[PDB]
């Protein structure tokens, strides 16, 4: 496991142990988006505006149809536990596509009920309706409370132009979502107490189940996470400060987050997770396997830590650690017990660890801070694993090796001659 | 050309041959955006709001002017076929800048007509006008149908506040576009039967031709693609599944798309293309030259295929291929003719290819599927080209080589001493 104390001596600071919650299961609910609003048949107003709006919808529902059809074509008995799902189609489908296809076979039993509700949704003037399966008609609330009043108040031709503007606004917001798809977008259009669980729920991708090109309807499966806290799992953030080697600034280029699961130690790719104050909520395990030298470094064999040169000011030169300061006092003006007493670190030491046992007040570049009395902050280190991050640099040093290798081969040829 | 059958044996699955259409020519049309709306001179309402709106416009039209001026300064007889275009200016201009500059010399003959229409657009209250060259006045439809009615209905001071809000909304949507520029954005502001040809047209970049800082106008050249289907051109998607080497998971890191043009075989960077159901529509040829080992691998010399370690679950472990399954049955529980009969692949085999001649029902991790009877799915392989994707890993292994190289040189020195 992580040896946090030794890693400080190479400027590697491991902090903020947070737990992890994974959405190992999902509860599914269905949403029917009915994109054409209903205008009262008594007046026939807005027909031309709906015709133009329909022409815009084709530019996003037809691409959705093509994608869903491609998923349905992966699989050409069923309805029995442990039965066969279907026949493999002629083509190629990766595991991601097979899972998507299998999910649609599971949703098939719902589609036969949704196809009944669609007949009721057609003639209905309601904006939101539930039969559970929820159905929404795009602009229908605005039509009921703005356009239908207008047709009496202002006459048919003036009110049609008001509908056209509303429909074109709705098309612009539809394009942002459908032009995977997260619940956050759908919830934005149509408007447990942990805020972070709510935020994570909107992060989950919705699954398209049907795209009806006749009635301009999209059926979506909404997935609600069931969150389970994994035991013996800790995610740490790690920061590296500059490390002095003969008056040149180096640092250990470790990944931004690391993870432990008992004896396993690896990185964490939390880019898809929601970071709460005390835990990460992730759709799946973010762990990945580290380079052998990085894993060995983190396990406390700090001689193995890879090091690279500091190219910019993004790398911090100092940090607070456990009530004291860990800093590169060559490039940072470390000061002890008053702004005049500079702490000098010898050229062969990489970072200075300053504790309350040595300084009551520590000044970093003039900033005076008191050390913490309850702080728990506590040899020759040679870091041979010099590393370059930039492909040009690696290529340049590879050319030097090849040049030296050709020279080595020549000595063999001449030496073989005298032999 | 691609040897799809052999590549399956290294877990490389080549699928979905799609054609390619390129926009080799463009038809140009001109659009004048007149950013200041006209308020009826009888009342002088809105003058103060327009002044504030003008001050906001400077923050985006002055940067456009500076960029356009920079393009016009590349070139300081003409009007004859095969004549000189102009004199090279004192400066530096890359081939991209020369093309932009030459395009402006071609548009010169249009500017002398656009400068006549600008005089009519000034006093006119029309929102869209054509003289073809199209001209649009920013908020003019709203001004005609909302603000001018208001000034009688509610008086001058109340209606000014309504204009100010409208202008600020238009500024926000102008900033998203102008703060290259695609026609999709312009079409969003101002509201053949193949949908994918329409989507590609909106993908094309508009060209700014003039920025008038006196009348607050932008002139744009809209380019309409002429699409031509290239013969003997096929674009394939390729997916790599995990490959077993002594109970460790490897894969071939091939590019996401590959392309053939007769004998030429290379990659395709379709990131700018529109993927239709049967072809890709691209602004220019997406092909790029592959590494010699990747081209040889794809040509069926599968011993040459580069291989890298599986670091995450993104790499699929199994796929459907031509009516059967290609999978790494070490880490995947492959099952034949019933969930109890596990398929065992030997440790020296990378992937298992399961066909209808061997299994009627194939189970992947419990998921039972029937094999396809009309499926067309059909030696020691040593993959020596081990490859690392991460610069740290390359640097670490380069240090080991250099360390071994210094040791080799020492043996030469002592051997030369005894000789």
């Amino acid at each position, epitope marked *: 496991q992580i040896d946090i104390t030794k890693l400080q001596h190479v400027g590697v600071l491991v902090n903020s142990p947070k737990g992890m919650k994974i959405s190992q299961n999902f509860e599914t609910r269905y949403l029917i988006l009915s994109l054409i609003p209903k205008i009262e048949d008594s007046n026939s107003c807005g027909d031309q505006q709906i015709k133009q709006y329909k022409r815009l919808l084709d530019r996003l529902i*037809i691409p959705l149809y093509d994608g869903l059809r491609l998923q349905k074509d992966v699989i050409v008995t069923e309805r029995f536990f442990g039965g066969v799902i279907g026949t493999i189609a002629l083509g190629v489908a990766t595991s991601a596509q097979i899972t998507a296809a299998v999910a649609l076979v599971e949703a098939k039993q719902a589609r036969s009920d949704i196809e009944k509700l669609k007949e009721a949704i057609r003639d209905t003037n309601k904006a939101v309706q539930s039969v559970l399966i929820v159905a929404i008609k795009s602009v229908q609330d605005y039509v009921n409370k703005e356009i239908v009043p207008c047709i009496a108040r202002l006459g048919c031709e003036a009110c049609g132009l008001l509908l056209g503007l509303a429909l074109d606004q709705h098309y612009s917001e539809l394009t942002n979502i459908f032009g995977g798809i997260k619940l956050q977008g759908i919830a934005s259009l149509y408007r447990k107490y942990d805020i972070y669980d709510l935020l994570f729920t909107e992060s989950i991708k919705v699954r398209v189940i049907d795209v009806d*090109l006749n009635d301009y309807s999209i059926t979506l499966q909404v997935r609600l996470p069931l969150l389970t806290r994994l035991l013996n799992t800790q995610i740490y953030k790690v920061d590296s400060i500059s490390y002095n080697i003969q008056n040149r600034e180096w640092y250990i280029p470790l990944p931004s987050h690391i993870m432990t699961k008992g004896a396993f130690l690896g990185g964490a790719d939390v880019k898809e997770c929601i970071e709460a104050f005390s835990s990460y909520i992730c759709p799946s395990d973010p762990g990945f396997v580290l380079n052998h030298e990085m894993e060995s470094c983190l396990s406390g064999n700090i001689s193995q830590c890879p090091r690279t040169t500091v190219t910019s000011d993004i790398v911090p030169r100092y940090a607070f650690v456990n009530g004291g300061v860990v800093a590169n006092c060559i490039t940072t003006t470390c000061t002890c017990n008053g702004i005049g007493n500079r702490i000098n670190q010898p050229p062969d030491q990489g970072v200075k660890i300053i504790t309350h046992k040595e300084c009551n007040t520590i000044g970093i570049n003039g900033m005076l801070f008191n050390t913490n009395k309850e702080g728990t902050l506590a040899d020759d280190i040679t870091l041979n694993n010099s590393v370059a991050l930039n492909p040009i640099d690696i290529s340049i040093e590879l050319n030097k090796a090849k040049s030296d290798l050709e020279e080595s081969k020549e000595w063999i040829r001449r030496s073989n001659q005298k032999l | 050309q691609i040897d799809i059958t052999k590549l399956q044996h290294v877990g490389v699955l080549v699928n979905s041959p799609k054609g390619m259409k390129i926009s080799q020519n463009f038809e140009t049309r001109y659009l004048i955006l007149s950013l200041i709306p006209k308020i009826e001179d009888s009342n002088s309402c809105g003058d103060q709001q327009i002044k504030q709106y003008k001050r906001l416009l400077d923050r985006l039209i002055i940067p456009l002017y500076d960029g356009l001026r920079l393009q016009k300064d590349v070139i300081v007889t003409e009007r004859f076929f095969g004549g000189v275009i102009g004199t090279i200016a004192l400066g530096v201009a890359t081939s991209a800048q020369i093309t932009a500059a030459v395009a402006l010399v071609e548009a010169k003959q249009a500017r002398s007509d656009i400068e006549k229409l600008k005089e009519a657009i000034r006093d006119t209250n029309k929102a869209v006008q054509s003289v073809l060259i199209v001209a649009i006045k920013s908020v003019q439809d709203y001004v005609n149908k909302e603000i001018v009615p208001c000034i009688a209905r509610l008086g001058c001071e109340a209606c000014g506040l309504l204009l100010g809000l409208a202008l600020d909304q238009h500024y926000s949507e102008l900033t998203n576009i102008f703060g290259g520029i695609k026609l999709q954005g312009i079409a969003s502001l101002y509201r053949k039967y193949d949908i994918y040809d329409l989507l590609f047209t909106e993908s094309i970049k508009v060209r700014v031709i003039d920025v008038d800082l006196n009348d607050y106008s932008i002139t744009l050249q809209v380019r309409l693609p002429l699409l031509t289907r290239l013969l003997n051109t096929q674009i394939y998607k390729v997916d790599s599944i995990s490959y077993n080497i002594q109970n460790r998971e490897w894969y071939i890191p091939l590019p996401s798309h590959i392309m053939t043009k007769g004998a030429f075989l290379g990659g395709a960077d379709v990131k700018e293309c529109i993927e239709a159901f049967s072809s890709y529509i691209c602004p220019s040829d997406p092909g790029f030259v592959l590494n010699h080992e990747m081209e040889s691998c794809l040509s069926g010399n599968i011993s040459q295929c580069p291989r890298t370690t599986v670091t995450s679950d993104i790499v699929p472990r199994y796929a459907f291929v031509n009516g059967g399954v290609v999978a790494n049955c070490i880490t995947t529980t492959c099952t034949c003719n019933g969930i109890g009969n596990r398929i065992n692949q030997p440790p020296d085999q990378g992937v298992k290819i399961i066909t209808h001649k061997e299994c009627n029902t194939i189970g992947i991790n419990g998921m039972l599927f029937n094999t396809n009877k009309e499926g067309t799915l059909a030696d020691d392989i040593t993959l020596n080209n081990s490859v690392a994707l991460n610069p740290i890993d390359i640097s670490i292994e380069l240090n080991k080589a250099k360390s071994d190289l210094e040791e080799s040189k020492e043996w030469i020195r002592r051997s030369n001493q005894k000789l």
Partner: nanobody, 124 residues
Framework: EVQLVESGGGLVRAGGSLRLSCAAS??????????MGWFRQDPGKEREFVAA????????SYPDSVKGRFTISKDNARNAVYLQMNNLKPEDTAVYYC???????????????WGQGTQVTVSS
């Protein structure tokens, strides 16, 4: 490569009958679920829907302008689609196109591929 080839168009007397045929090389098509249908175009107008058929179910669909006049049929073994036109009228003169496309093929935006069209001229 999906190719559609129409045949059977020509000049015809009003009240007469004509039978169009379309041969389809659907083996290259990326899906097995699709409609086939017929469209007509006057030289100054957009392509009107005329008929569509579900290739698997055989359900036929028509616009109200032609209901009961024209009938669409298919033969899956021939890869052929047919449109028999009866009680022809002068307004029926148009180029007729067969298409393979997305359900319901009620509008030309839904087609995957288009035939070359056949001229039908109806004369008094």
């Amino acid at each position: 490569e999906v190719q559609l080839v129409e045949s059977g168009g020509g000049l015809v007397r009003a009240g007469g009958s004509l039978r169009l045929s379309c041969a389809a090389s659907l083996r290259d098509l990326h899906t097995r679920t699709f409609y086939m249908g017929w469209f007509r175009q006057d030289p100054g107008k957009e392509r009107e829907f005329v008929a569509a058929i579900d290739w698997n179910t055989g359900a036929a669909s028509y616009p109200d302008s032609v209901k009961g006049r024209f009938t669409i049929s298919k033969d899956n073994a021939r890869n052929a689609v047919y449109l028999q036109m009866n009680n022809l009228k002068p307004e029926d003169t148009a180029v007729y196109y067969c298409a393979v496309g997305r359900p319901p093929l009620n509008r030309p935006t839904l087609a995957y591929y288009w035939g070359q069209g056949t001229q039908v001229t109806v004369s008094s």
